Design a protein around this ligand. Structure first.
Ligand code: THP
Ligand code: CA
Length: 129
């Protein structure tokens, strides 16, 4: 897998963000995660968390997996990095997302995220509290 450049256009919610990628606006859906919706318990806190992480980054990167790069809604499916730190992993590690939507051939970081979920859950964070 390889990191590629992108720039923030706007934070949307916990697990989607609008980025510029190869010079075109795209909504990205974070691979391998699922955040509570805004109206749900922790929904505002998961939006805040992603928004801060992407709005504060000096450098946003996009990393596609080995499988499909866009979902059925036209969202890009990637791992997103903010100053070298994976947003997908960080949400999970903070108990603001669950590992979810694990499809074969787009699952390179599954075990990494599962480990982070186990630590969040051990720490009773947020959705595990
Ligand atoms: C994360 C992800 C979601 N999706 C689709 C499946 C779900 O379909 P349905 O809309 O039919 O439920 C939806 C979940 O996204 P949200 O959690 O953003 O709603 O996005 C993929 O197809 N591939 C993926 O890797
Ligand atoms: Ca969601």
């Amino acid at each position: 897998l390889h990191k590629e450049p992108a720039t923030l256009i706007k934070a949307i919610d916990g697990d989607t963000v609008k980025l510029m990628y190869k010079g075109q606006p795209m909504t990205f859906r974070l691979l391998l995660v699922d955040t509570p919706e805004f109206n749900e318990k922790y929904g505002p806190e998961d939006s805040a968390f992603t928004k801060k992480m992407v709005e504060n980054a000096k450098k946003i990167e996009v990393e596609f997996d080995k499988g499909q790069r866009t979902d059925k809604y036209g969202r890009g499916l990637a791992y997103i990095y903010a100053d070298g730190k994976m947003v997908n992993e960080a949400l999970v590690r903070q108990g603001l997302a669950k590992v979810a939507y694990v499809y074969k051939g787009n699952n390179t970081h599954e075990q990494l995220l599962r480990k982070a979920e186990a630590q969040a859950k051990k720490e009773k964070l947020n959705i595990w509290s």
